[PDB]
Design a protein around this ligand. Structure first.
Ligand SMILES: Cn1c[n+](CCCCC(=O)O)c2nc(NCCCCC(=O)O)[nH]c(=O)c21
Length: 164
């Protein structure tokens, strides 16, 4: 049985691929240990939000491609953040600043993936600045988006393209 799920305000659906779960202990940009359930395998997902949608292709702790469309700069940026965290990429982990000890209304500690999400939703500047950039080749006729969230016809955040 396949099922959708919600992460970061987006409805995710795996559209192809597979993965196995493992636990990996990572050390953040502030030397905090997080034990994350890492998915190993190549997978493709849709992401559906109120004001943005995306297709995310990822492998093991690796964002391969994010094609994102949205109504405005902020909503595009929200989807990018969520996909970056969901990738479980090392560079996202290393972009963390300070400790992560977020707890919910119920005072329940958030799990590592949600700790990361809460942190980067608050401020993504470090994430975006450290993620990496690349020239676009225009083969999809799409547009780039830069770490400052401005569009670019030349370059984009690594693996990210913005579509109409
Ligand atoms: C980073 N990450 C976090 N999760 C868990 C999402 C929550 C799933 C749930 O609540 O059920 C993931 N699930 C998958 N594939 C598995 C997709 C399976 C579809 C399903 O059975 O729900 N891949 C990932 O990279 C991944």
């Amino acid at each position: 049985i396949s099922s959708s799920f919600s992460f970061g305000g987006f409805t995710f659906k795996r559209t192809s691929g597979s993965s196995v779960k493992k636990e990996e202990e990572v050390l953040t940009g502030n030397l905090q240990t997080l034990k994350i359930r890492v998915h190993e395998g190549y997978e493709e997902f849709t992401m559906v939000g109120r004001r943005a949608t995306a297709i995310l292709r990822k492998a093991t702790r690796r964002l391969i491609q994010l094609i994102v469309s949205g109504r405005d700069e902020q909503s595009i940026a929200e989807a990018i953040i969520v996909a970056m965290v969901f990738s479980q990429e090392d560079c996202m982990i290393k972009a963390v600043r300070g400790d992560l000890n977020f707890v919910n209304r119920a005072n329940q500690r958030l799990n590592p993936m949600h700790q990361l999400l809460r942190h980067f939703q608050k401020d993504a500047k470090v994430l975006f600045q450290n993620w990496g950039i690349e020239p676009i080749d225009n083969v999809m006729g799409m547009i780039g988006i830069l770490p400052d969230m401005t569009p670019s016809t030349e370059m984009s955040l690594r693996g990210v393209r913005v579509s109409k």
